């Protein structure tokens, strides 16, 4: 043994479960709300189902320049009306 408390000791202890009956659901709910508020879309820049294309276009907004790629994506994003 390396000195740390055995895992089987910890996870059958009432104090472990008093703490983690709160911290585990709290994290789950935080993850749920990260999506349900729509915040995940805006952090990572991922399209919503209605923002892959403009209403009549069928071409991909593909990045084609190296050093103006950032401006190209912003331009594609404007053109979504």
């Amino acid at each position: 043994t390396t000195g740390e408390r055995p895992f089987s000791d910890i996870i059958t202890s009432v104090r472990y479960w008093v703490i983690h009956s709160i911290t585990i659901p709290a994290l789950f709910i935080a993850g749920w709300l990260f999506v349900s508020t729509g915040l995940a879309y805006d952090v990572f820049g991922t399209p919503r189902p209605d923002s892959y294309y403009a209403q009549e276009q069928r071409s991909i907004p593909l990045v084609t320049d190296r050093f103006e790629a950032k401006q190209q994506v912003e331009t594609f994003l404007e053109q979504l009306k």
Partner: peptide, 12 residues
């Protein structure tokens, strides 16, 4: 507090 209260088979 003291580890042992909740039986492991129930945890599992």
């Amino acid at each position: 507090s003291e580890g042992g209260r909740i039986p492991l088979w129930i945890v599992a």
